[PDB]
């Protein structure tokens, strides 16, 4: 490994061997079908709302999120980087696909598959990832850095459907070596969302941009149709000329053949035929290839950038709506703009790298923080782009343009709901902290639904009863499903009735006030916009106080985010959120000079606080609730209200002494008595030190709950406990001794390490650990 010298991989990058087999991998622990794509994953490529592509540590383009809101795991074998090398003086060179595996479908038999084991490494620190190739049969050593310009406080490049592949090659040997690097790509028009003749009309064209000192050669892979089908658009791959490198190309090879049309050229001397052919295909799949060839002298280094773009301008959801994706604002909507996107990337990638560096460096250079923490903090952000993210720039065939661009991130793929608010309470820290204009947009979207009334009925999954879809004054669980109508038809979720949840309205208010606080307490307009919805939300919750203790009553069913775990009476969880929400609304009242509201919420808070304290404080911790069989369980999340109050600078809603004791209890029990504190905080433990069996969710660790708990610990000066607590989640996710959930962090696991709901929004809450 002489190539690690020649590139700058941060020490805190997640790392694994190319072709490594992992033995310990967890699987779903539920009886219903649940996604399990295996541990062969990697950092995603693609911007917010662009659709993302998961290129795994083995080199394959395998996890396809190009259809917005869907997860399709399948390796498109034609999509690869390959290398040719010939030592000066030898008769023959060698050619190798940089993929640790081979096709399962008979095609491309001529290519050299099965990249050997123990011959290179994969590294990731999102949005960056790297491959190193250190192969006894490749005298020139190779590395690539790949990324998308995911950049905080930037809403432009961050939207781009583009990836850069920055290659470094170095000759440590005593003889000259001829090297070729070749990028192949399948014309994947028709791969998603086309019912018949999936390849029909696909054609490929080569663009040579000869602008002086900025020469680019690219393939554009599209379709003859100029219609605006949601499957239509273009892919582009290409390369920028650098001194000392020659470019070659092949416009059209058949992907549904043996591959020799291309490979007989590449394997001979690493130079392609440069054959252009714009003839559309009918049945056969087709692809394009871009290569560079160069001679490396002893001790010489060369750097050459490739790029990939995809212009798929329209997203269609199952309910029929068709929307333009955000990046269309910058490149156009007609689906014929792949080359422009690619070119912007090839000409600006260095600037993008520095912008990413500028953002990561304050954290990476902080020598007080361990490497594992950094690994998790950055790599958890994968989900922001990878979470079925929808970001619209107009409905298709809309006359009126709007000022606003609606956004949504999925709960997960198994539970296909946009912006599940009970979850985003945890999972939206990165958006408020790094892309706050999106965050405020999302919360305006929630404000606008408060008073929506939809009197149509639905069957509640848990119990069979009928219920009203949306009630005036009750915040929605979610903003729809990719299978239906995102943003238009809310409350796609039906497992419980969210119109009687006791956490949604409180969390809504807490999120509003959070978003004001963590954007510098200057955005009075946002408070004005949301003020009425805040008062409605709290006033409707007050009415669910059946027993006149000043606090909404849990109703002996799962009426909150723990949607199989029944709460009854006053709960620590919903009770503390309520206290915190009342305190936040008082503060908003002071800010907006609304004396009537200040007085009302202050009075409500004083009564509720005293009653909460008297009903739940047992002298060690706050009981789970007042009326359950399991009322004295120790709930990891029992003081969620106070956690938020710390972030929102609302002071003590509960006495400092009691908080400290509760947190110590949770660490001693829920953490340290659960598999020795190596796997997070189990949600419910009995006071005798055995896990609560009342419901599966009590027996689960929730990744997003544990990261949030860790931040609460940290704010309260329990530094060791905080990081020890978080460490278990890191360990399970990323470590060789864990369960193999990198780039698919799940909601939850049980004691045995098996999981529920991979690729989940809630653990983005690790960013609460960075709160200033
Ligand atoms: Ca009550
Ligand atoms: Cl256009
Ligand atoms: Cl360390």
UniProtKB/TrEMBL annotation:
* Enzyme Commission (EC) number: 3.2.1.45
User: Domain of life of the organism in this record?
Assistant: Bacteria
A single GO BP term for this record reads: glucosylceramide catabolic process
Q: Which GO terms describe its cellular component?
A: membrane
Would the keyword Hydrolase turn up in this protein's UniProt record? yes
* Keywords noted in UniProt: Calcium, Glycosidase, Hydrolase, Metal-binding
Q: Which InterPro entries match?
A: 6-hairpin_glycosidase_sf, 6hp_glycosidase-like_sf, B_Glucosidase_GBA2-typ, GH116_catalytic, GH116_N, Non-lysos_glucosylceramidase
Residues the entry annotates as binding Ca(2+): 545, 547, 549, 551, 553
Name the enzyme's class: hydrolase
Under PROSITE patterns, the record lists: PROKAR_LIPOPROTEIN
Query: What GO MF terms are annotated?
Result: beta-glucosidase activity; glucosylceramidase activity; metal ion binding
Q: Where is the Glycosyl-hydrolase family 116 catalytic region domain?
A: 407-769
Q: Where is the Glycosyl-hydrolase family 116 N-terminal domain?
A: 42-352
Name the UniProt record assigns to this protein? Glucosylceramidase
């Amino acid at each position: 490994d002489k190539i690690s010298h020649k590139i700058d991989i941060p020490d805190s990058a997640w790392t694994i061997g190319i072709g490594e087999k992992f033995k310990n991998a967890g699987h779903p622990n539920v009886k219903y079908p649940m996604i399990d794509d295996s541990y062969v994953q990697g950092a995603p490529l693609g911007g917010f709302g662009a659709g993302t592509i998961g290129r795994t540590y083995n080199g394959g383009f395998s996890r396809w999120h190009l259809e917005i809101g869907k997860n399709k795991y399948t390796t498109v074998y034609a999509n690869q980087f390959s290398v040719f090398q010939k030592v000066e003086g030898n008769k023959d060179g060698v050619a190798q696909v940089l993929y640790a595996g081979e096709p399962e479908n008979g095609y491309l038999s001529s290519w050299k598959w099965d990249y050997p084991k123990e011959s290179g490494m994969y590294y990731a620190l999102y949005p960056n990832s790297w491959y190193t190739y250190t192969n006894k049969d490749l005298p020139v050593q190779l590395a690539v850095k790949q990324f998308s310009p995911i950049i905080p406080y930037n809403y432009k490049e961050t939207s781009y459907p583009v990836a850069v592949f920055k290659w470094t090659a170095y000759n440590p040997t005593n003889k000259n070596v001829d090297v070729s690097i070749m990028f192949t790509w399948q014309n994947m028009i028709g791969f998603f969302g086309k019912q018949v003749n999936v390849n029909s009309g696909n054609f490929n064209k080569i663009i040579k941009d000869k602008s002086k000192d900025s020469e680019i050669v690219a393939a554009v892979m599209g379709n003859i149709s100029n219609d605006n089908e949601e499957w239509n658009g273009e892919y582009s791959i290409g390369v920028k000329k650098v001194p000392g490198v020659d470019i070659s190309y092949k416009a059209k090879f058949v992907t549904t053949g043996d591959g020799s049309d291309l490979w007989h050229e590449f394997s001979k001397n690493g130079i392609l035929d440069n054959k252009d052919d714009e003839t559309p295909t009918k049945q056969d799949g087709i692809g394009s290839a871009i290569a560079v060839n160069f001679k490396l002298q002893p001790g010489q280094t060369i750097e050459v950038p490739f790029a990939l773009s995809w212009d798929l301008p329209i997203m269609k959801f199952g309910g029929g709506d068709k929307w333009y994706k955000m990046y269309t604002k910058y490149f156009g909507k007609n689906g014929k703009n792949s080359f422009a996107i690619l070119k912007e990337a090839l000409n600006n990638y260095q600037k993008w790298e520095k912008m990413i560096d500028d953002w990561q460096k304050p954290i990476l250079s902080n020598k007080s923080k361990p490497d594992w923490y950094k690994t998790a903090l950055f790599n958890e952000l994968y989900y922001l782009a990878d979470g079925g993210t929808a970001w619209e720039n107009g409905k298709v065939g809309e006359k009126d343009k709007r000022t606003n661009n609606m956004f949504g991130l999925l709960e997960c793929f198994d539970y296909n709901y946009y912006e599940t608010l009970d979850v985003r309470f945890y999972g939206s820290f990165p958006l408020v902290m790094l892309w706050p204009d999106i965050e405020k947009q999302v919360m305006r979207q929630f404000a606008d639904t408060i008073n929506v009334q939809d009197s149509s009925e639905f069957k509640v999954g848990s119990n069979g009863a009928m219920a009203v879809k949306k009630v005036q004054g009750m915040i929605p669980h979610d903003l729809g499903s990719s299978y239906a109508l995102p943003w238009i038809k809310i409350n796609a979720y039906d497992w419980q009735n969210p119109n009687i949840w006791k956490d949604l309205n409180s969390k809504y208010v807490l999120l509003v006030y959070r978003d004001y606080v963590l954007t510098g307490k200057t955005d009075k307009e946002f408070l004005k916009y949301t003020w009425k919805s805040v008062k409605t939300a709290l006033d409707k919750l007050k009415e669910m106080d059946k027993d006149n203790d000043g606090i909404p009553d849990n109703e002996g069913i799962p009426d909150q985010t723990y949607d199989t775990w029944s709460m009854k009476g006053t709960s620590a969880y919903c009770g503390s959120l309520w206290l915190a929400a009342l305190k936040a609304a008082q503060e908003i009242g002071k800010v907006l000079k609304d004396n009537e509201a200040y007085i009302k919420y202050n009075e409500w808070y004083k009564i509720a606080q005293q009653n909460f304290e008297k009903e739940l404080w047992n002298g060690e911790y706050y009981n789970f609730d007042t009326e359950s069989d399991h009322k004295d369980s120790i709930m990891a999340d029992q003081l969620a209200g106070q956690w938020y109050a710390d972030i929102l600078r609302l002071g003590d809603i509960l006495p400092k002494d009691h908080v400290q004791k509760a947190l110590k209890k949770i660490y001693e029990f829920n953490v340290m008595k659960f598999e020795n504190g190596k796997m997070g905080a189990v949600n419910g433990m009995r006071p005798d030190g055995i896990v609560d069996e009342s419901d599966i969710q009590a027996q689960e660790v929730w990744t997003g709950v544990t990261y949030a708990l860790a931040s609460f610990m940290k704010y309260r000066g329990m530094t060791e406990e905080a990081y020890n607590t978080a460490y278990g989640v890191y360990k399970m996710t990323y470590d060789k001794s864990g369960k193999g959930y990198w780039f698919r962090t799940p909601e939850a696991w049980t004691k045995d390490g098996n999981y529920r709901a991979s690729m989940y929004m809630r653990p983005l809450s690790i960013w609460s650990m960075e709160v200033n």
